[PDB]
Design a protein around this ligand. Structure first.
Ligand code: A1AO6
Ligand code: ZN
Length: 224
């Protein structure tokens, strides 16, 4: 998170830290618990082995609040496209259910035709980089404003407002950045978006997946 603050410890108990391994090496992402057995994140966070930590604030130290669960299944959207970064959404089936408590519980999703309009203020949280090269051990957060479609259409050739949200005022040094991928955009306590991508500079606007567009695929997947 660029330009943010340390979160109040355990104030966002839906937050998941992902440690990802594949032949391509090690990666880090965020994610969020949407049911006792499922975490939602981005498809570009896929790996052959993913371990999830819930209940964390400082993910570099042991805390008896943490729950460590390997993902039994990593289900990318069937039309996820690496090249355009379209349909950037993935469900993790946990190998066991979490023990729900003050520090570990799910977050609500939007309704289908509810919407999210320019000018809405939201929060994004994660363990990602705070500048170009430096990181953090502890969860951080920042408030970002929803931008108009054209502000992303102008700078991102493959942007589609049917499936993506445009986020962050270029006037402020405030953004989700590397390490924050997969984490939630919370608006009025609901997870409307998923951190997807942006410019290497970290200067907004940036691109989130629009959850409302994938609700059918989400529901069908979790039901089966
Ligand atoms: C297996 O996992 C991985 O390979 N990864 C997690 C690496 C990866 C990241 C990442 O480091 O988070 N991002 C997000 C991203 C990258 C660059 C600029 C950004 C600016 C703003 C922003 F909010 C996000 C940005 C990706 C996007 C697409 C593909 C891969 C990645
Ligand atoms: Zn604590």
């Amino acid at each position: 998170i660029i330009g943010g603050r340390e979160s109040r410890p355990h104030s966002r108990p839906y937050m998941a830290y992902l440690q990802i391994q594949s032949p391509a090496g090690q990666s880090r992402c965020g994610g969020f618990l949407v049911r006792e057995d499922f975490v939602l994140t981005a498809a570009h966070c896929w790996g052959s082995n993913i371990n999830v930590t819930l209940g964390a604030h400082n993910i570099q130290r042991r805390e008896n609040t943490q729950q460590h669960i390997t993902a039994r299944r990593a289900i990318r959207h069937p039309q996820y496209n690496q090249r355009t970064i379209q349909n950037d959404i993935m469900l993790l089936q946990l190998s066991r259910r979490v023990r729900r408590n003050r520090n570990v519980n799910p977050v609500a999703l939007p309704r289908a035709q509810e919407g999210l309009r320019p000018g809405t203020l939201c929060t994004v949280a994660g363990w990602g980089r705070v500048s170009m090269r430096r990181g953090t051990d502890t969860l951080r957060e920042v408030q970002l404003r929803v931008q108009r479609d054209r502000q992303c259409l102008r700078i991102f050739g493959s942007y589609d407002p049917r499936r993506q949200i445009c986020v962050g005022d270029r006037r402020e040094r405030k953004a989700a950045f590397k390490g924050d991928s997969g984490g939630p955009l919370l608006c009025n306590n609901v997870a409307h978006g998923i951190v997807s991508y942006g410019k290497s500079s970290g200067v907004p606007p940036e691109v989130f997946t629009r959850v409302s567009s994938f609700l059918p695929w989400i529901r069908t997947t979790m039901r089966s």
